[PDB]
């Protein structure tokens, strides 16, 4: 069909079988880079806006505000542009020129916050703008907004089910907001009734899900796996449906993403390398020898040209 605007075109991303990972082709990857603004977040940027429309919290002339300049910020920016909303994004002044350029290109009103305050300062400024005129501004809250996992239950999950003819046995996904693994797992286990293994992936540098589930002190840390390892348990991570948690280190995530590019011709982002590294570890366990492992690849390589990836 013909999509009425770019937001409706989300999803329907392909599955590709890996040749240099897994055992006898048991690892398949879902390419979320193939989306309106080239990441998995396109789905949630679309659905958070759509749901805010449906529930009346977002109306014509109201303005979106957020403190993300990562994939979610980019996603919200294309959706705002596609649907005629003004959007303000806050971010530390020390964010890259490429990212400022991208966001400005999409028509975002960028508000640069004090470098020394980091993300905390950007978040406080966003909250400040909203509080200044609550009837004018809407903050969509990707870590807690149920529209995030819901779109994965409605689209991402069913796509995996359909494209594997119900043969999927394991889903492996890095956790940022938790929305992907949560929605996918709800779709497959609850809507399609299949008892799969749901595998959350987090950085070994900030293994807060592992520490939490073990009853150990939660000690977040810095890492380079952009998009995952938020340093807390997000509301959109449904721990009830998580079967296993795999930790992967930043160097290995980067090396793996580089291998995806050079050995598979898949232009994967950093966190995609993390998810595949975790999946390859499971794929080479005899217990998973005859099992179909589907891995989410959240983003694409060109978004990382200025990073350690290249």
């Amino acid at each position: 069909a013909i999509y009425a605007d770019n937001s409706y075109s989300i999803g329907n991303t392909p599955l590709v079988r890996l040749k240099h990972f897994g055992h006898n082709g048991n690892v398949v990857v879902k390419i979320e880079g193939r989306n309106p603004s080239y990441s998995v977040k396109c789905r949630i940027g679309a659905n958070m806006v759509w749901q805010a429309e449906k529930d009346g919290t977002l109306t014509k002339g109201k303005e979106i505000v957020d403190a993300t300049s990562g994939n979610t910020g980019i996603a919200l920016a294309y959706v705002a542009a596609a649907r005629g909303y003004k959007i303000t994004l806050t971010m530390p002044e020390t964010m890259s020129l490429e990212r400022k350029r991208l966001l400005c290109g999409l028509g975002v009103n960028l508000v640069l916050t004090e470098g020394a305050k980091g993300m905390k300062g950007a978040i406080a400024k966003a909250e400040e703008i909203v509080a200044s005129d609550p009837s004018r501004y809407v903050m969509l809250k990707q870590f807690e907004n149920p529209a995030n996992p819901q779109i994965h239950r409605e689209t991402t999950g069913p796509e995996i089910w359909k494209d594997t003819d119900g043969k999927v046995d394991v889903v492996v996904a890095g956790v940022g907001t938790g929305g992907s693994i949560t929605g996918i797992s709800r779709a497959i286990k609850l809507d399609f009734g299949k008892q799969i293994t749901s595998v959350a992936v987090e950085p070994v540098e900030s293994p807060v899900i592992s520490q939490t589930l073990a009853g150990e002190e939660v000690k977040p840390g810095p890492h380079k796996i952009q998009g995952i390892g938020a340093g807390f348990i997000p509301k959109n991570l449904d721990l009830s449906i998580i079967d296993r948690v795999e930790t992967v280190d930043s160097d290995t995530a980067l090396a793996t993403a580089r291998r995806l590019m050079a050995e598979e011709g898949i232009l994967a982002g950093i966190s995609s390398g993390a998810a595949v590294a975790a999946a390859d570890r499971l794929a080479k366990l005899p217990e998973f020898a005859d099992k179909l492992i589907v891995v989410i690849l959240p983003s694409a390589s060109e978004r990382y040209l200025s990073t350690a990836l290249f």
Binding site: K41, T68, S69, G70, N71, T72, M91, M119, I123, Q142, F143, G176, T177, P222, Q226, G227, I228, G229, A230, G231
Partner: peptide, 4 residues
């Protein structure tokens, strides 16, 4: 980091 939470810049997701």
């Amino acid at each position: 980091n939470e810049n997701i």
